[PDB]
Amino acid sequence: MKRDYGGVGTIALRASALLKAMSQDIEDQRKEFNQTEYYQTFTRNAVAKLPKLSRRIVDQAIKEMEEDGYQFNKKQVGNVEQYALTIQNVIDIYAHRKIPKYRDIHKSPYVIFVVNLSTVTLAHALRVHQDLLRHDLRILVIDLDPQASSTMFLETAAQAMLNNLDAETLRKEVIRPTIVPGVDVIPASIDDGFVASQWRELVEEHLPGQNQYEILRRNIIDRVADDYDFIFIDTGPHLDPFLLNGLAASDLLLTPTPPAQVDFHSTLKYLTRLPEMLEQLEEEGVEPRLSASIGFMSKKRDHETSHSLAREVYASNILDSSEALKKARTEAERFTKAVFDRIEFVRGE
């Protein structure tokens, strides 16, 4: 309440009022998802081209499945009904053919910490990758950064951590569905800034006797453990309690390294500070779950020079990646399967 500071309130009132001007913008979000174009159609020959399958596996499965009930997807082109198999169609075929799902080879939840200085987009990528469907992946993305991941949609992760909810509530009330059926998101908000700020205090008041850095693991990860193969944690750079919760609940650090000689140094400085961050956990008497790290490149002088530099710092934990649709989409795909293979590499080995 004073004069023009009593006017910041004025701009605020008008800002929230124009935020209602937003329904006109929600339809713009679909303009961004229309570019994703994901309702891939699969011709029986393509499916037969997939891993562990063949023109004869597809046909036997299709016939067999068709017979006990199952109804595959079809399109009516011209006057003929061609088969257009969906991701679930292909996924069920692998199940009919009895190929083991990822959840049949690996004990529940592998947690990944993504270094922010894109994530849901990676999660979507891993789920719908041709040579990866056989795994039937279940991925959840936890948003502990007051901004981006919540973009993919039709109670924040911070709130849920404090509300101390049970698996049934998390499953049916907090965890929200993304545009891709296999990937789920627990959203973030600006308002998480206030929680991140008064964390320990709020912890002591609502979660008595619980360690302030085991709360991500305790109240979410562990309660949704049998539900997801991969769990990606998205946080800001700046934050520390929320950033520390991610470092204590994750198994693998995933560090994306920018080509710009400008950003390459930011990342380098960031990475140079993680040890001190782990020590704060150690001081609280909590063991970090970290057991593996991976770093890659993206995106002319800088790029070409940065890639050869990352090898120096990441050593054996470095990867590759990026005319536009044909070429790039492909380059991207190759990256995804690269990331998956590395996780598999560092995991059950």
Q: Which is nearer to its own copies, 4 or 166 (CB)?
A: 4
Q: State in angstroms the smallest separation of the CB of 290 from its own copies.
A: 3
Provide the residue count of the chain: 349
Question: Of Mg ion, its own copies, none, which one does residue 8 interact with (CB within 5 to 8 Å by kind)?
Answer: its own copies
Cα angle 84-135-36, degrees, rounded to a multiple of 5:
50
Q: Which is nearer to its own copies, 63 or 273 (CB)?
A: 273
Q: State in angstroms the smallest separation of the CB of 242 from its own copies.
A: 10
Alpha carbon 106 to its chain's center:
18
- The 3-state DSSP class for residue 69 equals coil
Question: Of its own copies, Mg ion, none, which one does residue 187 interact with (CB within 5 to 8 Å by kind)?
Answer: none
Q: Which is nearer to Mg ion, 164 or 211 (CB)?
A: 211
* Token reading at 266: 């930011």
Q: What's the start-to-end Cα distance of the chain, in Å?
A: 62
Q: Which is nearer to its own copies, 9 or 181 (CB)?
A: 9
Q: Which is nearer to its own copies, 5 or 39 (CB)?
A: 5
**Rg for the chain, CA atoms, rounded:** 23
Q: Could you give the angle at which helices 55-67 and 87-96 cross, rounded to 10 degrees?
A: 90
Beta pairing class for 183-186 and 176-177: antiparallel
Q: Could you give the angle at which helices 261-283 and 301-314 cross, rounded to 10 degrees?
A: 30
Question: Which residue stretch of 32-40, 197-205, 284-292, 308-316 sits at the interface with Mg ion (rule: CB under 5 A)?
Answer: 284-292
- What x/- string results for residues 23 through 62 when contact with Mg ion is judged by CB under 5 A? ----------------------------------------
Question: Of its own copies, Mg ion, none, which one does residue 183 interact with (CB within 5 to 8 Å by kind)?
Answer: none
Q: Which is nearer to Mg ion, 202 or 281 (CB)?
A: 281
114, 156 Cβ separation under 8 angstroms: no
Q: Which is nearer to Mg ion, 173 or 287 (CB)?
A: 287
Q: Which is nearer to its own copies, 236 or 259 (CB)?
A: 236
CA nearest 74: which of 41, 45, 50, 46? 41
Question: Of Mg ion, its own copies, none, which one does residue 298 interact with (CB within 5 to 8 Å by kind)?
Answer: none
Question: Is residue 286 part of the contact set for Mg ion (CB under 5 A)?
Answer: yes
Question: Of its own copies, Mg ion, none, which one does residue 286 interact with (CB within 5 to 8 Å by kind)?
Answer: Mg ion
Taking the alpha carbons of 103, 104, 109, 112 in that order, is the dihedral positive or negative? negative
Give CA–CA dist 274/256, Å, rounded. Answer: 15
Question: Of its own copies, Mg ion, none, which one does residue 77 interact with (CB within 5 to 8 Å by kind)?
Answer: none
Question: Of Mg ion, its own copies, none, which one does residue 100 interact with (CB within 5 to 8 Å by kind)?
Answer: none
Helical (H) or strand (E) element with 257: strand 252-257
For 271, residues 6+ apart whose C-beta sits below 8 A from its C-beta are 255, 313
Give CA–CA dist 345/246, Å, rounded. Answer: 22
Q: State in angstroms the smallest separation of the CB of 251 from Mg ion.
A: 16
For 115, residues 6+ apart whose C-beta sits below 8 A from its C-beta are 253, 254, 255, 256, 267, 270
Q: Which is nearer to Mg ion, 101 or 218 (CB)?
A: 218
Question: Is residue 183 part of the contact set for Mg ion (CB under 5 A)?
Answer: no
Q: State in angstroms the smallest separation of the CB of 310 from its own copies.
A: 9
Listing from the earlier edge strand, what are the strands of the sheet with 110-114?
176-177, 183-186, 139-144, 230-235, 110-114, 252-257, 292-297, 318-319
Point out which residues bind its own copies (CB under 8 A).
2-5, 7-12, 14-16, 18-19, 21-22, 25, 28, 146-147, 190-191, 193-194, 196-197, 236-241, 253, 261, 265-266, 268-276, 278, 287-293, 295, 309, 312-315, 317, 346
Question: Of Mg ion, its own copies, none, which one does residue 191 interact with (CB within 5 to 8 Å by kind)?
Answer: its own copies
* Token reading at 309: 């530099």
Question: Of its own copies, Mg ion, none, which one does residue 328 interact with (CB within 5 to 8 Å by kind)?
Answer: none
Residues within the interface to Mg ion (CB under 5 A)? 286
